[PDB]
Write an enzyme that holds these catalytic residues in place. Structure first.
Site, PDB file in Angstrom:
ATOM      1  N   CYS A 237       0.819  -1.185   0.000  1.00  0.00           N
ATOM      2  CA  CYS A 237       0.000   0.000   0.000  1.00  0.00           C
ATOM      3  C   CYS A 237       0.859   1.242   0.000  1.00  0.00           C
ATOM      4  CB  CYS A 237      -0.913  -0.028   1.210  1.00  0.00           C
ATOM      5  SG  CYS A 237      -1.702  -1.620   1.430  1.00  0.00           S
TER       6      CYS A 237
ATOM      7  N   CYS B  46      -1.015   2.944   5.950  1.00  0.00           N
ATOM      8  CA  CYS B  46      -0.720   1.605   6.453  1.00  0.00           C
ATOM      9  C   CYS B  46      -0.381   0.766   5.272  1.00  0.00           C
ATOM     10  CB  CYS B  46      -1.931   0.991   7.133  1.00  0.00           C
ATOM     11  SG  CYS B  46      -3.381   1.103   6.083  1.00  0.00           S
TER      12      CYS B  46
ATOM     13  N   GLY C 250       0.081  -3.226   3.829  1.00  0.00           N
ATOM     14  CA  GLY C 250      -0.359  -4.572   4.095  1.00  0.00           C
ATOM     15  C   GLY C 250       0.829  -5.413   4.499  1.00  0.00           C
TER      16      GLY C 250
ATOM     17  N   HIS D 223      -8.393   3.386  -4.151  1.00  0.00           N
ATOM     18  CA  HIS D 223      -7.143   2.940  -3.586  1.00  0.00           C
ATOM     19  C   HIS D 223      -6.373   2.047  -4.564  1.00  0.00           C
ATOM     20  CE1 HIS D 223      -4.831   0.955  -0.041  1.00  0.00           C
ATOM     21  NE2 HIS D 223      -4.106   1.843  -0.699  1.00  0.00           N
TER      22      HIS D 223
END
Lengths: 393, 393, 393, 393
Positions: free
Chosen positions: C89, C379, C381, C349
């Site tokens: 991410c 954040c 993954g 996203h």
């Protein structure tokens, strides 16, 4: 009104799954045996007027057109009707029968019936490739297993085997030894040179020059009992009897017969190897499709006017010993007159060719022992049986 | 060879590729038309002696037992033998024909001939998947184009159609006009309520609303020569007259007829719709596979000793404007009597189904016009045609 | 020793899964924003000396080479080092950071950092294609889900969401309204014309002439509460809070910044939009990867010497409201200074671009409100967090 | 920018494509070399500050979190940030480099740089699978050749190698000789027991016997110039000097180094194997990507202010005989000091791993010869090279 005879009858040898026929497509196996069976029949392609092939599993687009490609590729006129046909395990005979049928009804006086099956080349389908999976994993379906699985109860033919084995009480030990036998009869038959003339070799171009396949490779000559009781039942957890050892192989092959209206053989003066006597089909239970031969066999015998133990030779197919033993019994056949060279357990079970392959076997044995009458049959997946009988010249 | 008749003939409406029948499988298609065809003859599941069914592309494992599954799921008895046939485009009559042949030869009196094809659900195959493609790109094979390609020259049927268009001198406009004609005819035929009779509707119950399909959605109502005139000829680079406009469609359908023996039919208090007078097969040049009907047809009269003038109603499948006219050109045929209601251009061409499908259109229609002699024929991929002629009651 | 600034910063608009960016490959989205960000920077490709892109999912072979293709395709010299990078991410920021890093260490004075991600084109792998499945069905793995699934506990990031939602007690109602909000802020922001200058449209050649994509299409202007409480928790059966409504979208996009050694900007006399202050990474728990920003953010603030509520603008990414709300709280951020235009819930996203996209967002807002200090984080993954902060000119 | 050193460096033996490491995944490869590399530095899981890892082809979902999974499964702390990098062939140093960069900038002192690649397990992709290929054949993409194709000209690296072979005037024999040299060198190097030190063995316990792998099985011991002389040049139709004989292999391996800060290392009572003196990047013409090391290298000395004469030991990856010599040609380099133990031709080239892999060969060897200055460089697909130089303790 009319009558049909078999001038020539021929076959590839049988390959193991992913063995020596791996790279040979059903179109090619089939074209070959077409060409070869003409040569023996001493017959032009120009003078053929119908072709029927049995096949089940499409390896590729040609297989949609398979019977025209086998015919056309093996010299037959483009002027000739050709049809591919599917009755599962019984497709090869059935092709024989539908070939027979057109001649009987005067559609023509020269017909070819054959089959081809290349389980090594069976494909995987991608059912979601056309319109996509939006999302989530997806599948590649094994088409060969597809073919070996009842289309109502989504179970393996081996599962149906247990059923018939229990229905008729054929114990593991019948099956294991029927199997050890099939091997004996085959290995012996092979060494004995019994198949040489019926087999057409497949010249395969390979590195180090060519490589040629003529000998049925599924058969095992070190055939031991304790070899093949070492197996564990493959199709069920508890109460198992059916194994890899006592079940049909997965195999690659083709086979053809040239046939004729009797007269036309005389006018040609070709020496047939037999006439068609009669044939009879049946739908038996799917959960026990393995006995279809018994009903079909009963039916065929009637329309011949002949009876059991008129029967010099029987080739009736070993899908599984569990069903082969069953089919022997219910009909009170004599073990050593039924599949005397071995069968699907020993040489293999190229499903859609099998029906036509054993025909070529049986006819060719008849000439060895010079009996007069002959029975080929087999069980057909999905609850069917097929049968024909022929008569030495 | 004592007489055979159709007691009922019933079919689905025809899906467009990826239309109403997207999510409906052949098994389920075939099972429906059987059950319904059998109702229309008042015939029980357990009376049926035999099943043949014309299909070409296998969509799933079950398609391998296609005819058998059409049968049982459709209430047919286990006892009956079932069979699948492939002859590409002609597969649908052959089913009718091969089955006919079982009555003629008194294998039984009560039997069924169908067809089923879902081009929607044609799979893609992964030929490398089993043994793996060790290195290098691999393929996924559009099996539906596979059906639509000639197996010798690997060229689309539409390409052959250009070749027929040349030899036999058809032009962009004659075909374009013909195409329009088929559409007018079709749009009217439905409006006439001609097809209500034959079409079994297809219930597939959606969540949040459930839907039926009972009208042949490929038909371009509200259409014109301008639409035809507009298209670019797709199948060849130079000098092309053939387009998606004037070509056959890609579609989904099933269809089945119950047939009987002159006796069992009269001896069941059953008005028949017609009877089988004869049939004709023909092998021709793959490159011009579109004329197979003409040779097969010349045969077909001869066996019945009838003539072109003689027949009242005619369903010769239109795969293409070019061949379909070229068929009639060379048979001088009465164009207003030819696909009275249109064809694969209009209604569409789901090939395995089609032979069965035109037959139904034919028989039913014969009643509408109360004629006597009726033609069904169609060309086939790889170089063939097939024909059959019947008469009223 | 040295210092780095951002001359230009730009992005495609964001596509929905299988929406308007469907047919546009990451190589192309990326080449574009590279070319565009040069133009704004008023900078030649010749004078760039490093490129880093963030991407996660390989659509095709180019994506193995992606950063060189985006660079080279968008005008940068072939004489320039280019590197693709993956931190899930966080990849897009991370690319920014690794771009930053080379300049900081005098590898060069002009660097580009960007990202591209096309979830609509994520593939399926066939893990058994190389060396075959001998036998049995097989798989086509969805790589996109691959990417959304913890590689230890084989669970979806949404599952990790529940975890953080429970750990910090963020109730469904926080999440639903945080979501309804994100939409408001985005729709408003869009109508307000806020993104026009940062967005580079994608001219796509299409039928009926060209078609152009400039407006982030994931956002919803009819944003209703009862719209999006109608959803049911998608990632767990019992105790669910996380929905489609309150979770990140799956989306397509690219983004680039041109950066510079301060001096070189002065020597160019280009007006940057900010300097890099500092950056800080972290590995948090995988089962709660959703809070990685909080630790990373704490770390970054230190090395700046600055503290919370020095913070004029924060873009910190809404993977899920469940985690976005959590990350706001633990850091005591002011809701309306965190993601004031909306975020991953509203615009989307595009995982590997996201880090670089919101950078371009944040920098561009800073110029709207003329605050001085700025925080982007997200954040990652698998249990990671990333963060940087910048300073208005 | 205070000094960094390697405290340990460890690797696997190198699988052949589809050899020892067939069934071993990158995750598991990477996890091993980490755990083992960390043991050799006496360093705990929980002390590690950062992880970067060079990989190129994704083999499964987990490969997307590659570095992170190498880490944790290898006993590394959750806390540590982890990263995957792609720079194709150079991916393996960059890992070392990018990580170095985190210490230099005092993001941490304890960090790790690895590489991992399993070409064995390269997937095939189905780009049409998600949205479906509505009609027409589709593809399955050899992702491993994808890695090995230049993304601009879609030609194999070997093709580029021909171009380098031309410009820089290498011939079939110089490369063929070189190839032999690498093999001699390699076969000896193992016999010397040189590699025992570095290689972590790989336990994969078979049922009915369990096996290890700890020697670089690609090496052609017992080989000759005749074997080279024999091959047909594969990569081009006309005037070709490059063959599988003299080319790099296709292989599987992993490798990792622990690195530290001059201080944390001295302050841990730790003999280091070397220290990072500098590094050099270079963008070049995709068509001749094989020379990237020479430009990157000229850079590399300059930053450190050292010279070609100066360095004791040299690992410049041999992708190919032609480029690898052409590298040395243009750097006048001491050929007996160049790949003292051989290279990708000999040991092999599993590209993501390789940069990490040569480094280990280098550092360890520097001890064997007790030199001071040591080179690691390699060319990259798409037009790049990468270099790094270190000194003892």
């Amino acid at each position: 009104t009319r009558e049909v005879v078999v001038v020539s009858g021929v076959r590839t040898a049988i390959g193991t799954f992913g063995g020596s026929l791996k790279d040979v497509a059903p179109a090619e196996l089939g074209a070959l045996v077409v060409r070869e069976a003409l040569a023996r029949a001493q017959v032009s392609g120009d003078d053929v007027g119908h072709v029927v092939f049995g096949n089940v599993i499409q390896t590729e687009p040609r297989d949609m057109y398979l019977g025209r490609v086998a015919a056309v590729n093996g010299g037959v006129t483009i002027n000739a009707p050709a049809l591919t046909v599917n009755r599962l395990c019984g497709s090869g005979l059935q092709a024989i029968v539908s070939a027979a049928q057109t001649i009987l009804l005067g559609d023509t006086d020269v017909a070819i019936g054959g089959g081809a099956e290349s389980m090594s080349r069976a494909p995987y389908l991608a059912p979601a490739a056309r319109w996509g999976a939006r999302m989530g994993d997806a599948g590649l379906v094994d088409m060969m297993l597809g073919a070996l699985h009842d289309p109502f109860h989504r179970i393996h033919m081996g599962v149906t085997a247990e059923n018939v084995a229990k229905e008729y009480d054929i114990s593991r030990a019948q099956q294991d030894e029927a199997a050890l036998e099939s091997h004996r009869r085959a290995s012996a038959a092979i060494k004995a040179g019994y198949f040489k003339d019926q087999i057409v070799p497949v010249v395969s171009k390979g590195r180090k020059g060519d490589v040629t396949f003529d000998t049925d490779e599924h058969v095992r000559h070190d055939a031991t009992i304790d070899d093949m009781t070492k197996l564990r039942p493959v199709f069920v957890k508890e109460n198992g009897t059916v194994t890899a050892g006592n079940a049909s192989g997965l195999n690659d092959a083709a086979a053809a017969v040239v046939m004729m209206e009797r007269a036309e053989a005389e006018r040609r003066g070709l020496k047939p190897l037999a006439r068609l006597v009669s044939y009879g089909h049946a739908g038996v239970d799917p959960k026990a499709m393995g006995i279809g031969p018994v009903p079909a066999t009963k039916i065929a015998l009637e329309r011949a006017g002949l009876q059991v133990s008129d029967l010099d030779v029987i080739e009736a197919n070993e899908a599984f010993a569990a069903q082969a033993c069953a089919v022997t019994k219910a009909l009170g056949l004599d073990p050593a007159k039924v599949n005397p060279n071995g069968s699907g357990i020993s040489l293999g079970h190229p499903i859609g060719a099998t029906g036509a392959l054993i025909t070529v076997k049986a006819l060719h044995e008849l000439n060895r022992v010079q009996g007069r009458y002959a029975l080929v049959t087999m069980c057909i997946g999905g609850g069917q049986g097929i049968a024909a009988i022929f008569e030495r010249i």
